[model samples]
Target chain A: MTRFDVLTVGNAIVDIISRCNDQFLIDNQITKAAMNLIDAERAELLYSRMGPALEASGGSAGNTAAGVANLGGKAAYFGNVAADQLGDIFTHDIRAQGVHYQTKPKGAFPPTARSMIFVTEDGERSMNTYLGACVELGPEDVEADVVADAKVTYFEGYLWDPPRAKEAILDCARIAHQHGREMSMTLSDSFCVDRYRGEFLDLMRSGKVDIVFANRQEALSLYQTDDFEEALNRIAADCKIAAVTMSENGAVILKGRERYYVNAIRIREVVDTTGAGDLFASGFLYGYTQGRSLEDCGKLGCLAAGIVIQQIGPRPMTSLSEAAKQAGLI
Target chain B: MTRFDVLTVGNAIVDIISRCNDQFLIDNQITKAAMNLIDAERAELLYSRMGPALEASGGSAGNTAAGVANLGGKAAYFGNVAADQLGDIFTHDIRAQGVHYQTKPKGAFPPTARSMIFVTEDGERSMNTYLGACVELGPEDVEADVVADAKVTYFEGYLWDPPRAKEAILDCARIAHQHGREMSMTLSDSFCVDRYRGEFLDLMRSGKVDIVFANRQEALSLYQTDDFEEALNRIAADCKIAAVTMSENGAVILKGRERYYVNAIRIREVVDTTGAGDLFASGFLYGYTQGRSLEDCGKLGCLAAGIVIQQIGPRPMTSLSEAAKQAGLI
Candidate 1:
């Protein structure tokens, strides 16, 4: 098997993005800037009432894998989609980005997963995810060779929502460590952090996850504290590396006692913040696999987050490699 | 049946829009600024090679119907999609825009129609369309009461590509004229004009069509002329009213011996020009049905065209009614 910089596993999904007003969010009782898991019935009801939308492939780890490939890094991905049209779109897009994805589409019912994302005027996105075929992802789908070949095996905390996906993530983590590779994960969302706090803390403290990515809200939620510094310090003690992001305020990266803070890149507008964190992980992990300094990695992460937020969708329309070269990050 | 301002008939399609460099078009043998009808095999191949795309509801007349509704005009639509996921999306979106659409989805093979649109840096879009279920739009789908209720019955010239859809358009035109409503058609593409020149000319000269919309290239192709003024005069002679659009150069509206020219709205940037003409028709027909003067209709056309070109998708994200009010056109 060929070596890969990163291999990511999570629920495969297509995002249906629509622009709406603040009042629309209130009337629908949608929590702004957070993902709310919904069932098929609610998805049908909400979609019927929503305005026109744009659909694109966008799962947390899926975006990360696409980002890594766009940054001129070799990446592979494992996620579950059904044997359906949206699945065809998801497969075509990631593979077109030069990411290796070989997960067979599920032939059973439930169809492919989709997230209804509503973006308000301020560029904040509220997501209602319907985990359709994503619930079919299990330990059997995890390939040992791909996990062993990757420098880092990364997954998202959202996998915990899918009953059997947690086992799939753990199985890959086990194989990755056996091959002397690193394991990484994103906290996904603050509410997600709340759901899996104990298990996440155990994974970090047990040395299974060497690195973790989180936003400020997720970090605060993990430690059940309002104090940012305390949560950051506690997370630093548990994991070998912890990267915490603050919107507009930049990001802080901790490697035990070695802490590096990077300023956020200035952009004219924040068009959508849906994929900011995922793309940040893309740049950071790419930098890490390239053996760059921690400071440079943090800067790289900030650069990607800034670029993605200024666009409509989760993925970059322009080449990230060209953007990195222009920024002198590579 | 309640009175309607306009009823549009054509293919119901979802557009998969991807940003690509000019060379990608050349390599893929795509004709810039033109619509190329492709088969399913080619559609699959092209989509496999395309970068991540954003999918939205977009067919020429479907966009026009949505635009009229967005401008607060009472609009109804007739088109065909299959009983599939993309069909569900097209139906939900058009209905959400307040456009009345009641054509039943086909349950048989071929799925919904889709256009693969490649947008270059210069904001020009090249279309590769897979007709798919659009071919299933036959004369049986045309409702006589809907046609009778509308002030204007508009359909696209591209409907000629589907053998049965031509019959459907003719059926609607016959019903509309019997009810003393106006019959309008758009020269959908320049090449489309080349294919149906004789038939289109017969429709205009034989008094079956009262108003016709065309771009500069389409007008030039229709009359087989190199000179713009000669083509404009010929078209005006054939049809009672003719509106010819010139990108960036503005538009000209000709009614018998009278003519009025309106300047294009100056936008900071032209992000995508995909739906400019469709939207222009929306404004013009909306004004026409509202009993506004020909000059006001041209100005409204320019206004709608200008607003849509500033965004990525074909449909307007903001309220067109409010925009018209702000411009003092309503």
Candidate 2:
């Protein structure tokens, strides 16, 4: 196996976006911008009435792997897909972007996960997803060799949706620790934190999770405190490196005794607010993987987030590379 | 009963985000970077292992309504949510942002739709969703008075996920048309387009959709062609105003016989791909609602997208207003 700078693992999906009006939202009883999980039948029903869609292979970690590769880093991705059209798209999109994605499709029930994105006139997106084949992911999918080869193992919290996926993540964490590699995790959303607060706390306490990424809300929820500073202090004490993103307020990266407050990159307009933290992590991790200083890594994370927030998707490879060069990361 | 510049209708969702590693992904058997739809059981299971999470109120049309309110425009949002903690948060966040939201929570099988977002180091987000309470929305939810009172009626494509939501959308579409108010639709995602290609075409042909928003891929997918120009040709013949976003390549607004190519706002960094399109719609609709020209609407849209993509989540009230002021929308 080839050595990799980073290995990303998470659910794989295709994002299907459309635009709608507010009245339509009311009549449908759909939340304006919240993500709704649906069954395959519901997904198909929605698809039948939705306009046209754009198909891109996407997943949290998959996008990261692609981003790392785009930034001239060695990257690989490990996730599950099915033998279906969407699965093929997922496979092709990741591999085409130069990430090593080696996971076989499951010959089982359901199809690949699909995200139904609804874009309103204000440039906000509401998502409805069907997990489909993603539920099939199990611990058996974890590859020990891949974990050992990568310097860092990255995972997404969404994997917890599948019971077996949680086992897989735990398994990988153990392997990475055994191999003396780093393990990093992101607290994706606040509701998710509410769902798994106890387990996450235990993981952090056990030192199985070395790096943690959380936004302002997540940090608050995790520590059960309304004070942002208090939450940060608590998290800093637990994890080796903790990154807390504060939207345009910028982010704070705490490593051991040092905490770096990185400014957010300015933009001409504020469109949608998706994947902002993910891109920040991408930038920071790229720097980390490259052995850059903590402050520089934070800055890189800020810069990467700055670029991605300007676009519609998490991995805008072409623009990202150009940005890296400008930031002197390249 | 309040005077509002705009009103939105769609699903209500709480976003849950977390971070894990490749091993987590592999063990779970999830496809990396894809949106997976899971049942409540799965959602609960995933939450158990997820890291800390950020809880925020999000929805496509809801964000637009909030954006309008943020820009000093009167706005209201109408959508479904449960009387649950997540629902309460959704209500608080939107109202706190100064948008009027009045929709009762449902006491039904589905509690609320929650998006489980997993972010990796590469700035990518993989989502698994449990669309709980959104399923309860139906045609009865669309109030005639609300649709008639607003200057514009907005609909999100993701609303179609629940069959009743689709009925509600069409009901609102009719209400808006009867009131002689403009009706707008967003081809939320390319995959959504793929799912509802035929129905979307019918909606366009039926003259029910007045304004349409589609990204480059979505626009292309509508015509089942990869060529951007071809997609433009098809859209021009169908809708009065069709806005197509092309990620970093910018956007195209087709009004009547004229096609305006609005360049994307330049940004030094990109943080995430979430809500980029939603905020773009926000800016564009803000311009349109304010009686700006179609070309200017597209420009404003680009500007807004530029701003939001640099940060996390959807644009907050302050940042959104600042972005508009910078773009001269104010």
Candidate 3:
């Protein structure tokens, strides 16, 4: 087995968060509270006209890796970037956070992806993204040795955007299974499910994918059924372990003959929802890597998610290791 | 002058929200809460293995348009979608919410963009997205008549993703200005500002851009300085009107020699931050379109943001017009 507990493959992005009012939306002619992707040219146009911004290294899988590192777990990341300023920033930030990033930077194409976050007065953040060097990540970036070394080869749905990245992720998954390492994936977004329903179904049936993470709509979309229960059954039949997240209502975990219904973690306030899921995975993965029980693992995940939701960005402000200890995960 | 009160241009998306625990994250090898873009194949694979999901029609611009409609105002939208189920769903949902959606679906490409919203127990949401059909939007989608007719043309920073969308938005801005109408922009997110610093600055200085909207971080990033006051001064010197949002702290409005720091509308709880900014824009635009003072507009925006943030989505659960009437908008 590899020295690392978890290996993450996905985009490397920097989150820039700011605040704006309603007129800004009208005057700028933008949609409020939505995630939009932009190009370098447009990013330049909007950035010059924007207000103040706060920077943080962020990406779905990147955040998860950071969370694991925060929890004092062995973590490594596989992604691509240009040898540019932003790419350097991304590498430094994640490495400084204790994640092991081994993927090399590209010398050409776009820079690293950057998420432009617009936080309204109510703490709602609208996003516009520029996927720069992220496009360079392909199947070639996924190293077989890396996947074999890690206990879990984690992948994000977002990697599918660029065809090459998708190939790399699938390659990683294949190598992971070949090396007796478990392969896991997150249905990054619901709309993404809609875009690739057939392929997703095939992946599930292949048995190469061990665990699947999805929220409510994604599950429903996958089964093409409105009934939540029907979707649950479909998932149970297709995979050994399936996690269905229901916001507010909690989550349902299906593992073989055992099904666990975990309640939602409560919070006093939700500041910015940038990395709630990534952190939850960090907590849960930390527990899983440590051989915690299924129920306890779910509980740990909930606790981590709760902490992240209360703050901005994906990773929690406090150390995950300390939090896990308090929650008895240690 | 236009049949619609507001016209919006941005990405069209569907939000899939789920509740998850920390352990689920670990077992599945996924991140906690972060926004990543995925492809159809990966999206399918992940969804098939995911938990339950809650599907909703969402987009930064789409939400704002819905907010306007919810506020008893006429709003139209311009975006891209593919001839696919998700695109159909996105189009139908936005229209059902009382907004005009006239953009044609792309004959090619996957579908509309979708956001996977992972809402942990703490009510925080982590998102992963697939741009899909949103990437197909380009300058050809910009309608001159629509731009000329609407009193305000709003664009999202995310639109910058599809190179064509940026061109279309600029075309719309030019058209709007030619017809003596107003053009507005949202910094969208902070990372976006950092990515496109120089171009955005030119837009603000060129005088074609009438109003600017940014949150605290975005405002600061635009100036590439840490000083908030300096950013405010620079914006005031260029844009005719500028609104800076401070979450929980309220908002600041700058016009000519006048500045108004509007207090935030109090909320008992902030359930979800999906539509806070859109509703704020709805309230502020409702006032501005009707010739309210800058301070009053900012206040209206705050009231609207406060109300929507307490709910789940951007559209008001109750009649925003009635609430605004009570809040003295009438």
Candidate 4:
């Protein structure tokens, strides 16, 4: 039996979140609902012009690791941050959420990573990330024992931005398969998929990744097709299991010829859709490790995604385990 | 006319806020509904055990400065933070909120100040502050021109916790008075009042503080009395103006023989009451500097306080000026 349910790897970032008007996005020349990689100079320039913001521990897989732990799953995470105050905050927050984080921060030079996330009235988030100490993550940071001990080792596609992290994630896949463990990967976003479409497809088709998660747009971008069903079929054929989320339209899970469609939970309002997909992956992975049915896994994902979108920021404030029990999903 | 409506001085801190249950407070031996001063070691210990938290720029007077600017008033702030990542966050947030902040951060040594606030389900916040670089604040850091140019120079009683900050605040009062400007002070909290009751009384009786703000508990604690009316009378006789808040009951304002009672604005719920008093002072000072009546100033104070408690964090996410306009209070 594995000691840990999931091990997630990605950049370690503190999120600087602020509410802005649509005009602010337009004036700043920021693309709405996209993750834009910003250099250090651009980060400084944009932050100087942005409004007052709140900070929280956030990174694609970091949020998923936290979400898994919040759902009472034993989760471990591998990432990089600098030995700075912001790094201390990120470390403390993730650890406090009951996630096991042992990756060491680099010496104080490049500093910790940060994302300036602007949430507009339409519930869309525009992310501007500066990959600071995240660039320091490499194969040396990946834990072989943790990978082997985990039922599934998951990674975010966003980690591809950091050159060395790719090697580390690949190393994790090798270690996991040697121990009879599965590997999972999230497409992260459509833009991210466009940047590494070939590499991602290779990872899927080569059986390095057994389970794959992607949003509707990311799925479409991955297959380079406008037809959603065609992309779904392609993903199902490429991977052993595929989970495709369609925002408010719900989610689809496919395995071989079997398929399940889970409806999205309706919320009174969408405050900020920052970690919707990450939390969904958390719920699905948490249920998958517990041997839940595919439909039940999609329902768990939808419940978590619904709860997160109703509030600001990406991480859930309440206990997801208690929430799931209340909803009779356990 | 003064160049700025308000100039507020106090410790500059980033708040690490998390929600916890009453049992967590009991386990941690934390006193409910009060601020506790902790050293660096204790701060580290408590933070290590805290749940996943969000960070926001929040200091007693810093929050007021941001609030004043958010109400469309020109505001200036003076405080000390280190040249660290968290300090950069504090500086960026206040400046981006439309408040002028030019205080230079010290070279790397003591890190930026932080307060770990735990909010219970009842919306009560218990604060644990570590005044790191804030201890460096002294008369040398005070900007004479900005203090003299402000209509009201306000300082929080919490400044007394930092040894040298008292001198800086006194210097600001001198510069403000020399330029024919008013001086204001908030009692901060009951425990803060207890720590420096004699000094606070002298500041009011000697006319160094023209306006004094306090909640009912702080007022009661200051005079060492159980009778609320007696404490009110003593404050009215001591200072030119006294504004005392009484939670949901409303607030009382006293000036000479004039008295005004403003009822609290009703909200659907109270999320966190960390910055309720600070924002109340913000609205009151903003209105007072705009030449509004004492009644209107109290009403504005209630309005801002009302909005802040309905959300998490201290700073307002929406513009206070627009809310006031929409409510027909402006």
Best by DockQ: 4
**Residues A93-155, candidate 3, lDDT per residue (tens digit)?**
577677778789868457678877776656556677788888888877777777888998878
lDDT tens readout by residue for model 4, A5-75? 99999989999998888999899899888899999999988998888899999998999999999999999
Clashing pairs in 1: none
Q: Give fnat, all candidates.
A: 0.84, 0.00, 0.00, 1.00
Ranked by TM-score, the better of candidates 1 and 3 is 1
Ranking by DockQ: 4, 1, 2, 3
Runs with alpha carbons beyond 4 Å of true place in candidate 4:
none
Worst 10 residues of 2 chain B by lDDT: B48-57
Q: How do the residues B1-330 of candidate 3 rate in per-residue lDDT, one tens digit apiece?
A: 567778888888877555566665566556553345577787765554444343456777887787777777888899887775456556765775677778998674665677766555555555567888888788878878878888988777667656678788778888998888898777776666777777777877887678877888788888888999998898899788988898789999999778999999868887766666666677777677777898888988898888877755445655677888898767
For model 3, the docking class works out as: incorrect
Model 4 DockQ reads 0.92
The order by descending lDDT is 4, 1, 2, 3
What value does the interface RMSD of model 1 take? 1.0
**How close to the true structure is residue B252 of candidate 4, measured as C-alpha lDDT?**
94
TM-score of each: 0.98, 0.52, 0.50, 0.99
lDDT of 4 by residue, B200-229 (tens): 999998888999999999999999999999
> Which lDDT tens digits does candidate 1 get at residues B17-122?
9889999999999999999999989998898889888898999999999999999999999999998888998999999999999999869468999999999999
Off by over 4 Å in 1: none
